[model samples]
Target: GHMQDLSVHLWYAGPMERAGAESILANRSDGTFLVRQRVKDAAEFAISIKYNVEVKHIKIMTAEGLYRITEKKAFRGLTELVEFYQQNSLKDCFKSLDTTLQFPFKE
Candidate 1:
């Protein structure tokens, strides 16, 4: 006998937890974010195997600012920054999300 698929049982895909957390923080920390740019820039929006749909990761970006990455290395003066995942101190972002999500950190 084969199992019958139920519509109510349809899976609702969620955003990637870590990436989402990073996005939320990045959005808050920075200003002058552009939605179109985010959709274009993000590598993966959250992928859902079941739905076969990828949701774009849209986060805030810096329009104009110079955030010092290190004492020796600076941002080198750039405008309109986006994507916090690869940028300064993702720790703070992760920590904040961990507390809220109450999930144990794993290496």
Candidate 2:
């Protein structure tokens, strides 16, 4: 009933561009990130993370309101997806997490 829970999410950055995300997280430690809602893209949202020396933007695929990056891994809401990936690693043919998400981008 309350799917708009992302409004209070610590990692949520609504309608942010790739440039902003990269610049913000690039200098942070590996696993620091921000989630951007990119409605223009095929994927509704994207997770940008600082991986080692670079920033990574990984898309979140959605179907019938379910969210997923790796096909085998799926969640009902954006919050749920972020929550799970916080302690877990992401892996698939397209990409994999070098480190688990440690924190959201701050400042």
Candidate 3:
């Protein structure tokens, strides 16, 4: 199957279980990704995968202020997704995604 290109942005969060936990925001011309995570005090781990069709704009807000991404990174599918972190130094921030909700950590 042909995978669509999507914009992905990553950042660090202290609320997550891992010391270097990352928060990922992804969206495409079609739709946005439904992001979810396991509660630190909870049990079962939550996993999510989403699909939608439509070209749309993605926006993000933070404690500091409203922000927008002028230049962005694109991923074709799991291949690029996996290669992204592996080929870049950003992979250092994430050890694995098996337990954490961080994206780009692992496939």
RMSD of 3: 15.6
lDDT of 1 by residue, 8-78 (tens): 12121122263443343334323211121124355222211101122222222232334222222223221
TM-score of each: 0.17, 0.80, 0.20
Q: Candidate 2 residues 1-107, lDDT tens each?
A: 27574747778777677888787788777778888765654657677788877888887777777877655556788778777776676543118666666888863
Q: What is the full ranking by TM-score, best candidate first?
A: 2, 3, 1
Regions of model 2 farther than 4 Å from truth: 1-5, 38-43, 92-94
lDDT measured at residue 62 in model 1 versus the true structure, 0 to 100: 33
Best by TM-score: 2
Worst 10 residues of 2 by lDDT: 90-99
Candidate 3 per-residue C-alpha lDDT over 1-107 given as tens digits, one digit per residue, 9 for 90 to 100: 13221223232122333212222222322112222233546421111211233211222222222221111333333233333444443213222221222233222
Instruction: Go through the candidates in order and give each one's C-alpha lDDT.
Output: 0.24, 0.72, 0.26
* Inter-residue clash pairs, candidate 3: 29-54, 29-55, 30-54
